[PDB]
C-alpha cells in the first residue's frame, strides 16, 4: 500500500493557513523520490533527516499539514521563526523533525478579480504554541477602547484575506505548503520506504 501523498500534494483545494489541514499517514510504504526528483518545489527542507535518506527510514506517527500562504512568508514555516504566520497561524517547534515543501500556486490560487478566499489570522493576544490551531473569531481589542464583543474603532475582526491577483509580484503570490511531521523512535513503525 503506497502512502497517499498525491492526495495531500495534489488536492484540488487547500486550507487557509489559520485553519490549516492535517492528515495522518499510517500503515503504508512511502516513495519520497517522486518529491525530490521533481523541480516543481521552491522550498524542500528537512529537519533531523536528510531528504535523500528518507526512503531508508521507518517512521512513527507521520502527519501531513497543508495550507496556502504568501510566497514571502514561506521562511516562517521553519523551526525558530517569527512573524505573522509563525506567531498567529502555524507554528513549528524548535525541535521539529520532518520536511517543509512549498511551491508557487499562482496558476491555481490567483484570480483576475483577486482571490480573497484564503485567510490568515492578523491579530492575537499571544503567540501560538507549536502545532496549535486557532479558528476563533472573537473581536480583537487593538487599542485603549473596550470592544464588548462589538466591531468598531480599534476593535477588529481578527482574520484578514490575502489578496491574490495574477499580476502580483512573486513574493505576493500564493504558495501551497505541505509540512510532513516524523517521529524516529525505538518503537514500531507503520510508515517505511521502498
Amino acid at each position, epitope marked *: 500500500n503506497l502512502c497517499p501523498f498525491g492526495e495531500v500534494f495534489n488536492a484540488t483545494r487547500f486550507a487557509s493557513v489559520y485553519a490549516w489541514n492535517r492528515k495522518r499517514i499510517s500503515n503504508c510504504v512511502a516513495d519520497y523520490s517522486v*518529491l*525530490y*526528483n*521533481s*523541480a*516543481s*518545489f*521552491s*522550498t*524542500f*527542507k528537512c529537519y533531523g533527516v536528510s*531528504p*535523500t535518506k528518507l526512503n531508508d527510514l521507518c517512521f512513527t506517527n507521520v502527519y501531513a499539514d497543508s495550507f496556502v500562504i504568501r*510566497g*514571502d512568508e*514561506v*521562511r516562517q514555516i*521553519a523551526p525558530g521563526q517569527t512573524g505573522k504566520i509563525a506567531d498567529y497561524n502555524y507554528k513549528l517547534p524548535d525541535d521539529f523533525t520532518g520536511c517543509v515543501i512549498a*511551491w*508557487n500556486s499562482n496558476n491555481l490560487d490567483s484570480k483576475v478579480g483577486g482571490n480573497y478566499n484564503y485567510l490568515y489570522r492578523l491579530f492575537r493576544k499571544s503567540n501560538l504554541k507549536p502545532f496549535e490551531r486557532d479558528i476563533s473569531t472573537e473581536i480583537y481589542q487593538a487599542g485603549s477602547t473596550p470592544c464588548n464583543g462589538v466591531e468598531g474603532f480599534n476593535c477588529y475582526f481578527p482574520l484578514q484575506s490575502y489578496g491574490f491577483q495574477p499580476t502580483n509580484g*512573486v*513574493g505576493y503570490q500564493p504558495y501551497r505548503v505541505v509540512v510532513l511531521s516524523f517521529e524516529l523512535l525505538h518503537a514500531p513503525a507503520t510508515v517505511c520506504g521502498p
Partner: antibody
Amino acid sequence: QVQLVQSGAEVKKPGESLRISCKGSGYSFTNYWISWVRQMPGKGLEWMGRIDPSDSYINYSPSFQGHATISADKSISTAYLQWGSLKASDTAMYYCARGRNYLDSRGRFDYWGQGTLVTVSS
Amino acid sequence: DIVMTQSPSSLSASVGDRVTITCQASQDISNYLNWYQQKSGKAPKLLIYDASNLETGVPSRFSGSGSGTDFTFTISSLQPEDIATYYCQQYDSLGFTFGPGTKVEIRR
C-alpha cells in the same frame, strides 16, 4: 550590479585547515542560494553543494561525503567553503555562484565569483 | 543519481558555421536543463536556462531545445569569441548535476 568576490589563491600543506570565502554585493544576500563548484585540473565542473544564507540550510552533492563544509555569515554577506584537513586531491579551482531566489524553483547560476585556485602541496 | 552526457567531446568549425551539440540525461528531467559557456581562464557563464530560454544580454545566435532525456544547444553562426567549453546542467529541488562539457574550437 550583482557581484560575487572570492578570496585570493591559496597554497597549503596536506593536513592543514583552510577556509575560502565568497562575498555577495548588489542584491539581498539572504534571499538567494549560493553554490560551490569545483574544477579539478583539466576536468569539468562539479557541483559540490549550496547554502541558503537566511538559515544556513545546506544541500550537499551526493559525491562530497563530509570532506569540505559549506557555511555562511549573514552579517557580512559572505559564504564559505572549508576543510578541516586538506588532501592532495583538494588541489582545484573553486567557484561560488548565485543560484535561485528562495521563491523560485528554477535553478540556474546567473552570477559567479572569479574563482579561487587552491594548491595542496608540501 | 542522474548521469549527464554530452556529445561530441570536442569539435572544430569555421566562423559562420552552425554548431549543434547534444546533452543526454539518464532519466526524464522535463526541461530542467541549463547551458553554460566557460572560456579559458574565466568563470562559466549562463547562456540558456530551462532548456530554451535565452539569458538576458546573451547573443541571439545561441539557442537550446529539447526536453525529457535529450537536449540540444546550437550556435547558429559560430563567432571567433565562441571558443570555450559548453556544459549542460540538470537541476531539481535539491541540487544540480553538470554534464561533462563539449570543447568548441575554430577552424580558419
